[PDB]
Design an enzyme around this catalytic site. Structure first.
Site, PDB file in Angstrom:
ATOM      1  N   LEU A  39       0.804  -1.223   0.000  1.00 39.06           N
ATOM      2  CA  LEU A  39       0.000   0.000   0.000  1.00 39.06           C
ATOM      3  C   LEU A  39       0.842   1.281   0.000  1.00 39.06           C
ATOM      4  O   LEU A  39       0.292   2.370  -0.313  1.00 39.06           O
ATOM      5  CB  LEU A  39      -0.924   0.008   1.234  1.00 39.06           C
ATOM      6  CG  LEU A  39      -1.901  -1.190   1.383  1.00 39.06           C
ATOM      7  CD1 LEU A  39      -2.588  -1.203   2.784  1.00 39.06           C
ATOM      8  CD2 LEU A  39      -2.959  -1.168   0.289  1.00 39.06           C
ATOM      9  N   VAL A  47       4.155  -0.427   3.997  1.00 37.48           N
ATOM     10  CA  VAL A  47       2.893  -0.858   4.580  1.00 37.48           C
ATOM     11  C   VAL A  47       2.228  -1.821   3.599  1.00 37.48           C
ATOM     12  O   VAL A  47       2.105  -1.504   2.398  1.00 37.48           O
ATOM     13  CB  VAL A  47       1.959   0.331   4.935  1.00 37.48           C
ATOM     14  CG1 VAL A  47       0.636  -0.195   5.471  1.00 37.48           C
ATOM     15  CG2 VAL A  47       2.603   1.299   5.960  1.00 37.48           C
ATOM     16  N   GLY A 115     -10.756   3.543   2.791  1.00 36.54           N
ATOM     17  CA  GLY A 115     -11.144   4.710   2.016  1.00 36.54           C
ATOM     18  C   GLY A 115     -10.008   5.516   1.432  1.00 36.54           C
ATOM     19  O   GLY A 115     -10.272   6.442   0.641  1.00 36.54           O
ATOM     20  N   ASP A 156       3.703  14.940  12.879  1.00 33.09           N
ATOM     21  CA  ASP A 156       3.695  14.539  11.472  1.00 33.09           C
ATOM     22  C   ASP A 156       2.341  14.843  10.805  1.00 33.09           C
ATOM     23  O   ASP A 156       1.923  14.116   9.883  1.00 33.09           O
ATOM     24  CB  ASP A 156       4.148  13.074  11.256  1.00 33.09           C
ATOM     25  CG  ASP A 156       4.770  12.830   9.861  1.00 33.09           C
ATOM     26  OD1 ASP A 156       5.252  13.813   9.257  1.00 33.09           O
ATOM     27  OD2 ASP A 156       4.795  11.659   9.393  1.00 33.09           O
ATOM     28  N   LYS A 158      -0.131  16.009   8.175  1.00 32.97           N
ATOM     29  CA  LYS A 158      -0.145  16.303   6.743  1.00 32.97           C
ATOM     30  C   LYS A 158      -1.270  15.457   6.132  1.00 32.97           C
ATOM     31  O   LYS A 158      -1.711  14.479   6.765  1.00 32.97           O
ATOM     32  CB  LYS A 158       1.185  15.965   6.080  1.00 32.97           C
ATOM     33  CG  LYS A 158       1.630  14.525   6.287  1.00 32.97           C
ATOM     34  CD  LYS A 158       2.957  14.304   5.590  1.00 32.97           C
ATOM     35  CE  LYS A 158       3.592  12.976   5.921  1.00 32.97           C
ATOM     36  NZ  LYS A 158       4.911  12.781   5.206  1.00 32.97           N
ATOM     37  N   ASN A 161      -1.353  11.496   5.975  1.00 35.04           N
ATOM     38  CA  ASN A 161      -1.482  10.698   7.214  1.00 35.04           C
ATOM     39  C   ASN A 161      -2.906  10.623   7.770  1.00 35.04           C
ATOM     40  O   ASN A 161      -3.120  10.047   8.866  1.00 35.04           O
ATOM     41  CB  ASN A 161      -0.517  11.206   8.304  1.00 35.04           C
ATOM     42  CG  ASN A 161       0.924  10.798   8.013  1.00 35.04           C
ATOM     43  OD1 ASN A 161       1.174   9.895   7.175  1.00 35.04           O
ATOM     44  ND2 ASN A 161       1.897  11.381   8.739  1.00 35.04           N
ATOM     45  N   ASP A 174       0.484   6.724  11.241  1.00 34.48           N
ATOM     46  CA  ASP A 174       1.925   7.048  11.222  1.00 34.48           C
ATOM     47  C   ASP A 174       2.358   7.834  12.460  1.00 34.48           C
ATOM     48  O   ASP A 174       2.358   9.078  12.458  1.00 34.48           O
ATOM     49  CB  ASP A 174       2.366   7.789   9.947  1.00 34.48           C
ATOM     50  CG  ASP A 174       3.912   7.760   9.745  1.00 34.48           C
ATOM     51  OD1 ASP A 174       4.624   7.336  10.705  1.00 34.48           O
ATOM     52  OD2 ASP A 174       4.448   8.164   8.640  1.00 34.48           O
ATOM     53  N   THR A 191       7.664  17.120   7.824  1.00 36.48           N
ATOM     54  CA  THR A 191       7.695  17.364   6.391  1.00 36.48           C
ATOM     55  C   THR A 191       7.817  18.865   6.099  1.00 36.48           C
ATOM     56  O   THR A 191       7.160  19.679   6.779  1.00 36.48           O
ATOM     57  CB  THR A 191       6.386  16.818   5.845  1.00 36.48           C
ATOM     58  OG1 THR A 191       6.179  15.508   6.443  1.00 36.48           O
ATOM     59  CG2 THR A 191       6.440  16.727   4.330  1.00 36.48           C
TER      60      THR A 191
END
Ligand SMILES: COc1ccc(-c2noc(C(=O)O)c2[C@H](C)O)cc1
Ligand SMILES: COc1ccc(-c2noc(C(=O)O)c2[C@H](C)O)cc1
Ligand SMILES: COc1ccc(-c2noc(C(=O)O)c2[C@H](C)O)cc1
Length: 340
Positions: A39, A47, A115, A156, A158, A161, A174, A191
């Site tokens: 994935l 993952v 989803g 993290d 963003k 995620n 994550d 990031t």
């Protein structure tokens, strides 16, 4: 805050601490699962969709190569990730079901959310309306209220995620940069587009960096692009530290006001980090229509439900080269990962 909120957060911290102080270990093994599809893939990890052979349940299995974790200086971060995930419990956090290790790899077996990433949906439709952005933002505000109360910084945030579930709600995945921090911390991570100025400037920083990142996320959802965009990292960093931002004319006045207070360069003046904490955000005019209890209880109808056929469908994730899960005959890095 109401006594009811105080008592809820006090119970949440008690339950977290019990698992934090006595972590679970070694609760499955690799040959209990069939591998289905990759994935996503990164510098030290992947993952993969898997199926449990006895129950038929689907899971998302994060696989970290121990030798690559060491080379990329992520030992402490990967131990943080697993110890935090096995201790938290909140409606908008992906649930860890099993963890284990072998001679070569570390494994975290999560519930599978079919989803897809928010990022895919955002990029396909261009931008979300303010009510749609506000529904997701409210879930992040509650999740950060929960994590911060437990002395956890997420670090993290963003759109990649934030996974969208079968009811159209968010589940955050994550925890690779999450950390238990009672005061300040110092690691350069995150990031580029989402970093607060104090991270870029190599300062000791605190939970206010999550509230800055929420301002970047709300801007990106409502505009379709992040506020400090540029072609190379150094130019992004110059824009971030500058203390200016430009807003599209379609933004409401209430949205502009909230974002100027989350994207405040001076961390001592930033919403979420004042004397009233998260309540300055929850009580802002942009959130006046939000029923916070109804969101937590999952009683609000979502803006949309992702299209997928069932709990094994992978159509909302992308295609990667399929590589072996090889396990060496010799144990690698045993001392470094003793506690996993
Ligand atoms: C950070 O996330 C929260 C979720 C929920 C609550 C909460 N605050 O008051 C009640 C109540 O029972 O009245 C609740 C829940 C529904 O029990 C508080 C915080
Ligand atoms: C929980 O269900 C998941 C589905 C997919 C992923 C994933 N696959 O590649 C990268 C990710 C996330 C963004 O870290 C993770 C979990
Ligand atoms: C109410 O306002 C909406 C905005 C956006 C979406 C959306 N976001 O992503 C997709 C996708 O096809 O990925 C869609 C729809 C189903 O096409 C749905 C509703």
């Amino acid at each position: 805050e109401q006594e009811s909120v105080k008592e809820f957060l006090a119970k949440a911290k008690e339950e977290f601490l019990k698992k934090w102080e006595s972590p679970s270990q070694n609760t499955a093994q690799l040959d209990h699962f069939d591998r289905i599809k990759t994935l996503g893939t990164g510098s030290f990890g992947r993952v993969m969709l898997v199926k449990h052979k006895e129950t038929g349940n689907h899971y998302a299995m994060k696989i970290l190569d121990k030798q690559k974790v060491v080379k990329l200086k992520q030992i402490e971060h990967t131990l943080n990730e697993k110890r935090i995930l096995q201790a938290v419990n909140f409606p908008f956090l992906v649930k860890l079901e099993f963890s284990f290790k072998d001679n070569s790899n570390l494994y975290m077996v999560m519930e599978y959310v079919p989803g897809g990433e928010m990022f895919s949906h955002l990029r396909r439709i261009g931008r979300f309306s303010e009510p749609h952005a506000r529904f997701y933002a409210a879930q992040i505000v509650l999740t950060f209220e929960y994590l911060h109360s437990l002395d956890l910084i997420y670090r993290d945030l963003k759109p990649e995620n934030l996974l969208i579930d079968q009811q159209g709600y968010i589940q955050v995945t994550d925890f690779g940069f999450a950390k238990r921090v009672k005061g300040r911390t110092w690691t350069l991570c995150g990031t580029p587009e989402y970093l607060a100025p104090e991270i870029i400037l190599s300062k000791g920083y605190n939970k206010a960096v999550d509230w800055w990142a929420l301002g970047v996320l709300i801007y990106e959802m409502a505009a379709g692009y992040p506020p400090f965009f540029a072609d190379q990292p150094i130019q992004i960093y110059e824009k971030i530290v500058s203390g200016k931002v430009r807003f599209p004319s379609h933004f409401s006045s209430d949205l502009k006001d909230l974002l100027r207070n989350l994207l405040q360069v001076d961390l001592t003046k930033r919403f979420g980090n004042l004397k009233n904490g998260v309540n300055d955000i929850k009580n802002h005019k942009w959130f006046a229509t939000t029923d916070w209890i109804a969101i937590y209880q999952r009683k609000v109808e979502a803006p949309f439900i992702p299209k997928f056929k069932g709990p094994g469908d992978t159509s909302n994730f992308d295609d990667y080269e399929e590589e072996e899960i090889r396990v060496s005959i010799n144990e690698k890095c045993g001392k470094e990962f003793t506690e996993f």
